[PDB]
Design a protein around this ligand. Structure first.
Ligand SMILES: [Mg+2]
Ligand SMILES: [Mg+2]
Ligand SMILES: [Mg+2]
Ligand SMILES: [Mg+2]
Ligand SMILES: [Mg+2]
Ligand SMILES: [Mg+2]
Ligand SMILES: [Mg+2]
Ligand SMILES: [Mg+2]
Ligand SMILES: [Mg+2]
Ligand SMILES: [Mg+2]
Ligand SMILES: [Mg+2]
Ligand SMILES: [Mg+2]
Lengths: 127, 60, 206, 62, 98, 24, 155, 78
RNA sequence: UUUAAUUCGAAGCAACGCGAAGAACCUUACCAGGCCUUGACAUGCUAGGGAACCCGGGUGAAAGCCUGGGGUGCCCCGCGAGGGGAGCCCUAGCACAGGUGCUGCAUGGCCGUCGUCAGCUCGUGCCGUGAGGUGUUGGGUUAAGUCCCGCAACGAGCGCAACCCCCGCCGUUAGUUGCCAGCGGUUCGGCCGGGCACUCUAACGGGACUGCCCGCGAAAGCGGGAGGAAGGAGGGGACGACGUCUGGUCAGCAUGGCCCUUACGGCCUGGGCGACACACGUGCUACAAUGCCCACUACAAAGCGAUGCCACCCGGCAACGGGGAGCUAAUCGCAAAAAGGUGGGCCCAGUUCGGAUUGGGGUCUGCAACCCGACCCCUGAAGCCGGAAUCGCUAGUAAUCGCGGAUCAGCCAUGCCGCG
């Protein structure tokens, strides 16, 4: 019935549940394109469904928390791949050639004293 | 003006405003953290000895 | 300007607090202040006793002070009259009731604070520094240290030009965080001002 | 409400009125500088024109 | 039904108390909601290393107040008996609600 | 912009509320 | 830098046409990480290529890029007193990068007021062998050649 | 600007107001720059300290909302 | 430069949003003026009084000077007269205190800096009359004196790295204040039953090692590949060798020496550190259409708070004010995140760009906002992208967008340290 992947990216966490069906997709109880409305990049979320043909063959109940939409989009891209590799282990030999099962460790780097913001150094003068 | 200024800081006077933080070992009047009652020098000096309970070099 | 406090650098790991109580924002201020008037008083009165630490625990708002001395004889008294007044002194200056326990520092030659104090005391009494230093380090190592360092600051022998005579034996891996390097620091007050003394004793790993 | 000219009028009057027995604020206006407590050591270029570069200074020779 | 809240700076000796105040409470025959780790509040102190002049270079300290929650969900007199008498606190603060 | 108090952004910026950034 | 050749960043393909070359260009349109605006600007602009021709924007896009790539550039090299602008080849990679940047840089010199129109027309003009991007590129081969005399320092 | 009270100091207010039990001289040294000028105190020459000296300010109805300091520059030539 | 004073220090990098993580009074070290002297503070000795404490009266700007009252618990001779008495407090005398007065080449401590650069040494041997050399010159390799090979050296130490924290994958423990997948119910917001699965929280663990495969190489290593959340130091911290700089700090503290003693000490009121013809550093806001305004609608993290965060009403255009829950806070609050998205307005204009300056009328803190506070509400400067020059950054970096904190009554924070 219900397949699961946890998706995380950059302080975003995506609880992702996959069922079979017509093709519908909900994020925090909203339609996917109402939630991610106007964000050119949103579609990237489902890119792991297209990688196994199986787009419309699934319905997905997604909850998402923390971060911003684009992290959430990425987190969802990971949940969705984790979820479906869950219910068919072979969806992995063709899903790992793309990055879909990687987490993406890239995170805001820490502000450091003496710098203005991690690397950006104060302007230096001499004269 | 120092010994008598660490003293006049303890007496509490006309107008509540005139009172000020003032470090508890150093008489220092600047950079005293109200949690510890200590100057930022004082706090470092003690912190390193393990005499501020709980207090540790932070790193993240 | 460098080398951080080998104690401060350890704390969670390898080496423990000298005061372990809890207090919230409203309280810490006042208990810390006490701690300090406590340590301060014991720091001068128990000089002759060679005190290394003054650990301070605190529970049901009641205060136990362990004084880790080399010479409990001196803190105690004949049949304990001195420690009497000491328990009463603390009580005078704290509005409270304070346990004051002694604890013999088993080997004083592995107590960095003491080694340091001893060299400082030696200097205060016009002893040759280089030799005093070198000997302190022999004592430490003889007492089974894996390594030891001692450093006298400047105005050695009374000079105009301040200096810094160091001297060391064994390992003193200051960057190594599992090490357990006791560290200690006493003054020499002299006719010619202050010299500071640092001792590092390295005792073992893990 | 009033309003162009019969407003200009009012403003000037206020300021000239501020010369009175001469408040600090009333100097300042006379003097060209800013009124409202501002730093004159570095800015105030709105209340003075652009920069009158009356200069001359370096260090000690021998 | 009894909430006992444990604060501490040392997380090793907080946990050691939580476990103790549970070990003994189950031994009074009370059911206990295992010691729950509540989030840590952290207090940074960021301080100039030098006494005088050196506004860049500086050292971060933190004072991590740990928190543990413990519910004993149906409590005996025998249960109140062990707690309001049989103690082990050094640098830990417990406080009791209902 | 951020220097105009009499707007949304110059209010946010200054850290305040009024006729041009009402408290919710 | 000094140790090694440095890895060239593989851009993620485009979400519409699936072209890595489109996200490059988008990344040049992008200002202050406002990538939505950027891609939103590039796609409007692709629709302007519809309204003003029954051609696919991708085809015409790819054609502008091909006409703004330079063949050779003067690259500054130093003798030790006076300096010579020396002519030499352009890398494949550098070409692409130059092409897209000029395109954008050129597009924003333009006098129309919306960006999407600016980018569309400048794309149209460049695929028709003559925008302001193409002058830049021309200027650059007319800077080589104007200096073909010094092509014997080819570094 | 205050708005409950007019924050004038009483040592000033009294030396002033007893003085209008039939009007007298004006050797009225004060230090309270702080103090607002009050209605009808027009006529009193007040000697307001400016850090150095007391500078006699002749008072008048056009200047009531103003503190006394306002008419005694603390700093000399600009 | 000026001033009565504009206290003091920092001076290429490594002084100049630096000490200062909060200058109206306080701070405060300076100026003026008014006041105090065994002193605001300490240790102790002599003495008549007083001996705790607490209240008003004059004179003052306040300090202060002068004043007049309420009124002795305590050790103890005692059943009391009366009388010893120790704390404690004022008067005078004696020792002494006080000094942010000088010296950072008299110092300690701490810091900067070369530089996280890859170095700096030692023990014994051997070479050299010797200073010294070898080791640590060479070849390869590495982020690295990292490793390999070689070699009159064989080892070792301080450094590198590792051991420590954060971030990334997973597991075990735990299930409230946190979560809500499947139920059941429902005043919709997990609100109630249930449940801890997932998310979290936070404590302990696992996991990466060039381990495996291919190629090159004598080796160390390198190129590539596979698996894996993650490789080739996974990304960030903490961490700074022997030493350098007669570096910085006597104004945090300590300290030798020098100096002040009805004053160079101490208290106050006011002024000043905020001055402005200039010059420089670091920043902020901009010059706009990839923009600006207004409405509506989202998606964070890390912090902070019970004389404090303040929900929610109401009044007020509004700052704020009246009410007034909740919250010892994974509970309640600060909290709106902004940029984004959706509507609409602007139409290239010194403008619906930009918000300086100035006038008024308000609010709040505080004894008090004149010098000198912030905030709210009704003039609209320069500026059309900046000369010579010059800075930052190699990836979740720069760029841009907001959020929080320390100090703090308030705030001149556009700074700082953090968070996304
Ligand atoms: Mg950022
Ligand atoms: Mg600098
Ligand atoms: Mg204050
Ligand atoms: Mg700075
Ligand atoms: Mg505007
Ligand atoms: Mg000085
Ligand atoms: Mg020096
Ligand atoms: Mg100097
Ligand atoms: Mg010097
Ligand atoms: Mg200043
Ligand atoms: Mg103009
Ligand atoms: Mg224009």
């Amino acid at each position: 019935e219900q397949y699961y992947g946890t998706g995380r990216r950059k302080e975003a966490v995506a609880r992702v549940f996959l069922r079979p069906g017509n093709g519908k997709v909900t994020v925090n109880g909203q339609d996917f394109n109402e939630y991610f409305q106007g964000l050119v990049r949103a579609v990237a979320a489902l890119e792991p469904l297209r990688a196994v043909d199986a787009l419309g063959r699934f319905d997905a109940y997604i909850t998402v928390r923390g971060g911003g939409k684009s992290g959430q989009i990425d987190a969802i891209k990971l949940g969705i791949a984790r979820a479906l590799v869950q219910y068919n282990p072979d969806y992995r030999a063709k899903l790992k050639p793309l990055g879909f099962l990687t987490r993406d460790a890239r995170v805001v780097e820490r502000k450091k004293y003496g710098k203005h913001k991690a690397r950006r150094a104060p302007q230096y003068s001499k004269r | 003006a120092r010994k008598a200024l660490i003293e006049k800081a303890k007496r509490t006077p006309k107008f509540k405003v005139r009172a000020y933080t003032r470090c508890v070992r150093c008489g220092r009047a600047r950079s005293v953290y109200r949690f510890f009652g200590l100057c930022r020098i004082c706090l470092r000096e003690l912190a390193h000895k393990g005499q501020l309970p709980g207090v540790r070099k932070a790193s993240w | 300007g460098n080398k951080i406090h080998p104690i401060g650098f350890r704390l969670g790991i390898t080496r423990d607090w000298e005061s372990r109580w809890y207090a919230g924002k409203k309280q810490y201020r006042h208990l810390l202040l006490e701690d300090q008037r406590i340590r301060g008083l014991l720091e001068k009165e128990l000089y002759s006793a060679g005190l290394a630490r003054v650990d301070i625990e605190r529970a049901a708002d009641n205060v136990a002070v362990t004084v880790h001395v080399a010479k409990p004889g001196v803190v105690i008294g004949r049949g304990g009259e001195r420690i009497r007044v000491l328990r009463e002194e603390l009580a005078k200056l704290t509005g409270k009731n304070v346990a004051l326990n002694v604890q013999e520092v088993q080997n004083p030659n592995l107590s960095a604070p003491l080694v340091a104090q001893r060299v400082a005391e030696q200097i205060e009494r016009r002893f040759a520094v280089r030799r005093a230093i070198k000997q302190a380090v022999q004592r430490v190592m003889e007492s089974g240290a894996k390594g030891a360092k001692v450093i006298v600051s400047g105005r050695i022998g009374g000079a105009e030009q301040a200096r810094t005579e160091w001297a060391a034996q064994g390992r003193v891996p200051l960057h190594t965080l599992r090490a357990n390097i006791d560290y200690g620091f006493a003054l020499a007050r002299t006719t010619y001002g202050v010299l500071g003394v640092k001792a590092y004793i390295f005792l073992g790993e893990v | 409400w009033k309003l162009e000219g019969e407003l200009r009028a009012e403003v000037a009057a206020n300021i000239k009125r501020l010369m009175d027995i001469g408040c600090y604020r009333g100097l300042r206006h006379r003097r060209g500088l800013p009124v409202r407590g501002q730093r004159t050591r570095t800015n105030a270029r709105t209340r003075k024109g652009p920069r009158k570069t009356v200069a001359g200074k370096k260090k000690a020779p021998r | 039904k009894i909430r006992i809240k444990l604060r501490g700076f040392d997380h090793k000796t907080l946990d050691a108390s939580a476990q103790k105040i549970v070990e003994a409470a189950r031994r009074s025959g009370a059911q206990v909601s295992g010691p729950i780790p509540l989030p840590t509040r952290v207090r940074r102190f960021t301080v100039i290393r030098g006494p005088f002049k050196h506004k860049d270079s500086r050292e971060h300290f933190e004072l991590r107040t740990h928190n543990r929650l413990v519910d004993i969900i149906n409590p005996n007199r025998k249960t109140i008996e062990q707690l309001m008498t049989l103690d082990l606190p050094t640098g830990v603060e417990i406080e009791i609600k209902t | 912009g951020k220097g105009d108090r009499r707007t949304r952004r110059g209010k946010i910026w200054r850290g305040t509320y009024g006729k041009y950034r009402p408290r919710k | 830098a000094r140790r090694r050749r440095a890895e060239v960043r593989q851009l993620q393909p485009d979400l519409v046409y699936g072209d890595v070359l489109v996200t490059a260009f988008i990344n040049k349109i992008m200002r202050d990480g406002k990538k939505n605006l950027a891609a939103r600007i590039f796609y409007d602009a692709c629709k302007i290529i519809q309204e003003k021709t029954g051609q696919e924007p991708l085809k015409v896009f790819k054609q502008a890029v091909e006409n703004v790539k330079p063949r050779m550039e003067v690259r500054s090299r130093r003798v030790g007193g006076a300096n010579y602008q020396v002519p030499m080849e352009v890398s494949p990679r550098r070409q692409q990068s130059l092409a897209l940047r000029w395109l954008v840089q050129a597009a924003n010199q333009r006098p129309e007021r919306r960006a999407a129109v600016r980018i569309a027309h400048e794309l149209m003009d460049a695929a028709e062998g003559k925008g302001g991007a193409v002058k830049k590129k021309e200027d650059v081969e007319r800077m080589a050649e104007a200096n073909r005399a010094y092509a014997h320092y080819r570094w | 600007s205050l708005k409950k009270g007019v924050f004038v100091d009483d040592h000033l207010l009294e030396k002033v107001l007893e003085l209008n039990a039939k009007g007298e001289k004006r050797l009225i040294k004060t230090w309270s720059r702080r103090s607002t000028i009050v209605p009808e105190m027009v006529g009193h020459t007040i000697a307001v300290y400016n850090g150095k000296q007391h500078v006699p300010v002749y008072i008048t109805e056009n200047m009531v909302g103003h503190k006394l300091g306002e008419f005694a520059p603390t700093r000399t030539y600009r």
